[PDB]
Design an enzyme around this catalytic site. Structure first.
Site, PDB file in Angstrom:
ATOM      1  N   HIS A 169      -0.693 -10.054  -3.023  1.00 41.24           N
ATOM      2  CA  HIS A 169       0.226 -10.716  -3.923  1.00 41.24           C
ATOM      3  C   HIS A 169       0.057 -10.303  -5.370  1.00 41.24           C
ATOM      4  O   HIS A 169       1.059 -10.076  -6.053  1.00 41.24           O
ATOM      5  CB  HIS A 169       0.069 -12.235  -3.809  1.00 41.24           C
ATOM      6  CG  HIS A 169       0.390 -12.774  -2.445  1.00 41.24           C
ATOM      7  ND1 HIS A 169       1.451 -13.620  -2.212  1.00 41.24           N
ATOM      8  CD2 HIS A 169      -0.235 -12.612  -1.251  1.00 41.24           C
ATOM      9  CE1 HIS A 169       1.489 -13.934  -0.925  1.00 41.24           C
ATOM     10  NE2 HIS A 169       0.459 -13.351  -0.324  1.00 41.24           N
ATOM     11  N   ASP A 193       5.674 -15.458  -7.986  1.00 40.06           N
ATOM     12  CA  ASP A 193       5.587 -15.263  -6.545  1.00 40.06           C
ATOM     13  C   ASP A 193       6.318 -16.414  -5.882  1.00 40.06           C
ATOM     14  O   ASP A 193       6.145 -17.573  -6.272  1.00 40.06           O
ATOM     15  CB  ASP A 193       4.116 -15.251  -6.172  1.00 40.06           C
ATOM     16  CG  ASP A 193       3.830 -14.890  -4.717  1.00 40.06           C
ATOM     17  OD1 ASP A 193       4.576 -15.215  -3.776  1.00 40.06           O
ATOM     18  OD2 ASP A 193       2.730 -14.363  -4.538  1.00 40.06           O
ATOM     19  N   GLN A 207      -6.910   3.024  -0.902  1.00 43.13           N
ATOM     20  CA  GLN A 207      -6.149   3.140   0.331  1.00 43.13           C
ATOM     21  C   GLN A 207      -4.977   4.105   0.185  1.00 43.13           C
ATOM     22  O   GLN A 207      -4.732   4.922   1.076  1.00 43.13           O
ATOM     23  CB  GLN A 207      -5.645   1.772   0.794  1.00 43.13           C
ATOM     24  CG  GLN A 207      -4.673   1.894   1.946  1.00 43.13           C
ATOM     25  CD  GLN A 207      -4.604   0.644   2.781  1.00 43.13           C
ATOM     26  OE1 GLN A 207      -5.397   0.450   3.699  1.00 43.13           O
ATOM     27  NE2 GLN A 207      -3.626  -0.208   2.469  1.00 43.13           N
ATOM     28  N   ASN A 260       1.733  -4.452   2.005  1.00 42.61           N
ATOM     29  CA  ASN A 260       1.350  -3.404   1.057  1.00 42.61           C
ATOM     30  C   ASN A 260       0.741  -2.208   1.779  1.00 42.61           C
ATOM     31  O   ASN A 260       1.016  -1.052   1.425  1.00 42.61           O
ATOM     32  CB  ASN A 260       0.406  -3.920  -0.005  1.00 42.61           C
ATOM     33  CG  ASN A 260       1.079  -4.930  -0.906  1.00 42.61           C
ATOM     34  OD1 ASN A 260       1.863  -4.597  -1.810  1.00 42.61           O
ATOM     35  ND2 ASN A 260       0.774  -6.187  -0.651  1.00 42.61           N
ATOM     36  N   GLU A 277       2.192   1.616   1.843  1.00 50.29           N
ATOM     37  CA  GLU A 277       1.352   2.757   1.507  1.00 50.29           C
ATOM     38  C   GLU A 277       1.405   3.764   2.634  1.00 50.29           C
ATOM     39  O   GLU A 277       1.468   4.972   2.385  1.00 50.29           O
ATOM     40  CB  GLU A 277      -0.056   2.280   1.167  1.00 50.29           C
ATOM     41  CG  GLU A 277      -0.009   1.584  -0.218  1.00 50.29           C
ATOM     42  CD  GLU A 277      -1.278   0.919  -0.689  1.00 50.29           C
ATOM     43  OE1 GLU A 277      -2.109   0.484   0.137  1.00 50.29           O
ATOM     44  OE2 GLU A 277      -1.448   0.810  -1.940  1.00 50.29           O
ATOM     45  N   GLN A 320       2.584 -10.403   9.719  1.00 50.13           N
ATOM     46  CA  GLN A 320       2.122  -9.175  10.371  1.00 50.13           C
ATOM     47  C   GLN A 320       2.744  -9.020  11.748  1.00 50.13           C
ATOM     48  O   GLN A 320       3.072  -7.901  12.171  1.00 50.13           O
ATOM     49  CB  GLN A 320       0.601  -9.162  10.439  1.00 50.13           C
ATOM     50  CG  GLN A 320       0.010  -9.009   9.035  1.00 50.13           C
ATOM     51  CD  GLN A 320      -1.380  -9.605   8.895  1.00 50.13           C
ATOM     52  OE1 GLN A 320      -2.141  -9.724   9.850  1.00 50.13           O
ATOM     53  NE2 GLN A 320      -1.702 -10.009   7.652  1.00 50.13           N
TER      54      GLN A 320
HETATM   55  O1  LIG Z   1      -9.756  -0.623   1.586  1.00 56.44           O
HETATM   56  C1  LIG Z   1      -8.770  -1.181   1.083  1.00 56.44           C
HETATM   57  C2  LIG Z   1      -7.826  -1.992   1.785  1.00 56.44           C
HETATM   58  C3  LIG Z   1      -6.796  -2.549   1.129  1.00 56.44           C
HETATM   59  N1  LIG Z   1      -6.614  -2.362  -0.218  1.00 56.44           N
HETATM   60  C4  LIG Z   1      -5.489  -2.974  -0.900  1.00 56.44           C
HETATM   61  O2  LIG Z   1      -5.451  -4.325  -0.509  1.00 56.44           O
HETATM   62  C5  LIG Z   1      -4.084  -4.773  -0.399  1.00 56.44           C
HETATM   63  C6  LIG Z   1      -3.860  -5.264   1.013  1.00 56.44           C
HETATM   64  O3  LIG Z   1      -2.548  -5.860   1.011  1.00 56.44           O
HETATM   65  P1  LIG Z   1      -1.688  -6.017   2.322  1.00 56.44           P
HETATM   66  O4  LIG Z   1      -0.382  -6.589   1.902  1.00 56.44           O
HETATM   67  O5  LIG Z   1      -1.680  -4.743   3.146  1.00 56.44           O
HETATM   68  O6  LIG Z   1      -2.511  -7.039   3.217  1.00 56.44           O
HETATM   69  P2  LIG Z   1      -3.270  -8.423   3.002  1.00 56.44           P
HETATM   70  O7  LIG Z   1      -4.528  -8.027   2.311  1.00 56.44           O
HETATM   71  O8  LIG Z   1      -2.388  -9.413   2.184  1.00 56.44           O
HETATM   72  O9  LIG Z   1      -3.505  -8.852   4.449  1.00 56.44           O
HETATM   73  C7  LIG Z   1      -3.222  -3.571  -0.794  1.00 56.44           C
HETATM   74  O10 LIG Z   1      -2.858  -3.612  -2.171  1.00 56.44           O
HETATM   75  C8  LIG Z   1      -4.149  -2.392  -0.483  1.00 56.44           C
HETATM   76  O11 LIG Z   1      -3.848  -1.247  -1.268  1.00 56.44           O
HETATM   77  C9  LIG Z   1      -7.484  -1.608  -0.970  1.00 56.44           C
HETATM   78  O12 LIG Z   1      -7.341  -1.445  -2.176  1.00 56.44           O
HETATM   79  N2  LIG Z   1      -8.515  -1.028  -0.262  1.00 56.44           N
HETATM   80  N1  LIG Z   2      -1.155 -14.587   5.378  1.00 55.14           N
HETATM   81  C1  LIG Z   2      -0.964 -14.701   4.260  1.00 55.14           C
HETATM   82  C2  LIG Z   2      -0.670 -14.832   2.760  1.00 55.14           C
HETATM   83  O1  LIG Z   2      -0.190 -13.591   2.286  1.00 55.14           O
HETATM   84  C3  LIG Z   2       0.326 -15.971   2.590  1.00 55.14           C
HETATM   85  C4  LIG Z   2       0.137 -16.858   1.557  1.00 55.14           C
HETATM   86  C5  LIG Z   2       1.022 -17.882   1.395  1.00 55.14           C
HETATM   87  C6  LIG Z   2       2.112 -18.047   2.237  1.00 55.14           C
HETATM   88  O2  LIG Z   2       2.993 -19.091   2.053  1.00 55.14           O
HETATM   89  C7  LIG Z   2       2.297 -17.155   3.288  1.00 55.14           C
HETATM   90  C8  LIG Z   2       1.400 -16.129   3.451  1.00 55.14           C
END
Ligand SMILES: O=c1ccn([C@@H]2O[C@H](COP(=O)(O)OP(=O)(O)O)[C@@H](O)[C@H]2O)c(=O)[nH]1
Ligand SMILES: N#C[C@@H](O)c1ccc(O)cc1
Length: 474
Positions: free
Chosen positions: A15, A122, A355, A374, A378, A395
């Site tokens: 986020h 957000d 990443q 994200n 990528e 997901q």
């Molecule tokens: O080894 C890693 C893994 C993830 N990321 C960053 O962590 C975030 C992961 O966001 P994503 O929306 O994929 O998943 P979430 O972490 O919310 O499950 C992104 O900005 C990635 O670039 C990173 O910097 N290094």
């Molecule tokens: N999983 C996850 C988080 O990225 C998330 C935060 C708040 C929400 O309302 C929904 C999802």
């Protein structure tokens, strides 16, 4: 007059990242920016990386203000406890944020500061929209995940209307036949099944936090001046066209980071491992399986062991980012077969990596991913096909589209087993399956590049957003 945009992300790295991307772009275009952290997020970042790395540089400090608001959270609350985070933020942050807006207004007289001209919240952080509206300040919302994910959240209300949420039978929460049930009524995603909805609907609690907050968020976003989505319109066209009827004007800007690249602040609690790219340099083109599960998800020690044994038996070198707290419970040693491959130089396990750069490395031929948005953005920009293991949230929705619509991925079983992991990785690396998904990944890479370069569809939406909504400074 200088426009002054206040930006408010949810405290998760997926986020903060897109909102920080936007905040830096707005600062580059001459705006004053106030980036609002919760004290939970700020103090955790400080203790991990130190104040100097988290705060802005002195060159940008004039027009890039960091402000911190109360949230009532203990720093011990883990990122996987999404409901606990969401509930505290919606209950505790409104009055702190209202007070922040007041102080920013007083600083106009008190220090000749620019009045606030827009709030970019957000979608999750509904208090930001509430406070902006009270104060008569325009607000625009930024949904930080996929369009298909938003479409699923938008239809939580319909699940409630149809008696599907909450679940009346707890035994159905993980019944795979029931979760396979088609939901034929979702516009733009005719192939939605119950399991493909963002996972927070799987609750028996009629007062569930995440369902409640989702409904609040959809109602809030519907009332905003505009909705920013960090997606490629061409990728998610049917979904976006269905979302159009329920939201203010939608600006598809994705991949925002690549729009910016076409044309100084650490946002992570983890240190990116610098050895990764050098190790990948030593491997042949397309040879490496890259594995990563993002910043919030956790798995069981048994699941971790089967992934380890599957990687060790899959026929390919591998780079596994195994986040230090990704495994639930006490630390368990990795299998000897994997540890020996690491000793031979055939595999590498690191805690965190850069990443985007890893995915673009020529040695990488496959991304095994939890399907966080994200991470998928990528992968899309890099042209990497995806082997999906969705964990929570949207997901599951993203995996459904990766498999059935976008065409650049395939799915693992949710129950991890080393033999099936090895077999599917092999199919993705040398089989007809991988050839198909990799070819489609190449098409989306080209589409993303065209959208992000000057004149492209996402570039054009970023220009309209930055100019007409955010730098207007009325
Ligand atoms: O080894 C890693 C893994 C993830 N990321 C960053 O962590 C975030 C992961 O966001 P994503 O929306 O994929 O998943 P979430 O972490 O919310 O499950 C992104 O900005 C990635 O670039 C990173 O910097 N290094
Ligand atoms: N999983 C996850 C988080 O990225 C998330 C935060 C708040 C929400 O309302 C929904 C999802």
């Amino acid at each position: 007059p200088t426009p002054h945009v206040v930006l408010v992300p949810f405290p998760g790295q997926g986020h903060v990242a897109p909102l920080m991307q936007l905040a830096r772009l707005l600062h580059a275009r001459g705006a004053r920016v106030t980036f609002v952290y919760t004290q939970y997020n700020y103090r955790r970042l400080l203790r991990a990386k130190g104040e100097a790395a988290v705060r802005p540089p002195a060159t940008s400090s004039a027009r890039f203000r960091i402000e911190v608001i109360d949230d009532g959270l203990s720093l011990s609350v883990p990122q996987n406890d999404v409901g606990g985070l969401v509930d505290s933020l919606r209950k505790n942050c409104l009055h702190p944020f209202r007070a922040l807006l007041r102080r920013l207004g007083q600083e106009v007289e008190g220090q000749d500061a620019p009045p606030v001209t827009c709030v970019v919240g957000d979608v999750v952080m509904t208090f930001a929209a509430a406070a902006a509206r009270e104060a008569g300040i325009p607000e625009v919302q930024f949904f930080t995940a996929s369009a298909c994910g938003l479409l699923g959240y938008l239809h939580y209300g319909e699940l409630v209307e149809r008696g599907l949420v909450p679940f009346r039978d707890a035994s159905l929460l993980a019944d795979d036949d029931y979760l396979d049930t088609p939901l034929e009524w979702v516009p733009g995603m005719s192939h939605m099944r119950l399991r493909d909805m963002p996972t927070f609907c799987r609750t028996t609690d009629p007062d569930d936090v995440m369902v409640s907050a989702t409904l609040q968020q959809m109602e809030s976003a519907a009332g905003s001046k505009a909705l920013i989505l960090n997606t490629l319109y061409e990728l998610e066209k049917d979904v976006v066209d269905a979302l159009a009827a329920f939201f203010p004007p939608i600006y598809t800007v994705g991949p925002l980071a690549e729009v910016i690249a076409s044309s100084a602040m650490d946002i992570s609690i983890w240190q990116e491992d610098t050895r990764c790219l050098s190790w990948l340099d030593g491997k042949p083109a397309g040879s490496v399986v890259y594995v990563n599960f993002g910043s919030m998800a956790v798995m069981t020690a048994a699941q971790a062991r089967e992934f380890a044994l599957g990687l060790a038996s899959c026929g390919s070198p591998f780079l596994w980012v195994k986040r230090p707290d990704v495994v639930e419970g006490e630390e368990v040693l990795l299998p000897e077969a994997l540890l020996d491959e690491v000793a031979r130089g055939r595999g590498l396990v690191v805690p965190w990596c850069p990443q985007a750069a890893v995915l673009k490395h020529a040695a990488v031929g496959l991304f095994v991913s939890h399907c966080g948005w994200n991470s998928l953005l990528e992968a899309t920009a890099a042209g990497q096909p995806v082997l999906a293991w969705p964990c929570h949230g949207e997901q599951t929705t993203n995996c459904r589209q990766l498999c059935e619509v976008w065409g650049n991925g395939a799915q693992l079983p949710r129950e991890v087993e080393s033999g099936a992991v090895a077999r599917l990785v092999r199919e993705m690396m040398v089989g007809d399956l991988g050839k198909e998904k990799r070819a489609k990944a190449a098409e989306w890479k080209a589409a993303a590049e065209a959208a992000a370069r000057k004149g492209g569809a996402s570039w054009r939406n970023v220009e309209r957003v930055v100019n007409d909504l955010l730098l207007v400074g009325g």
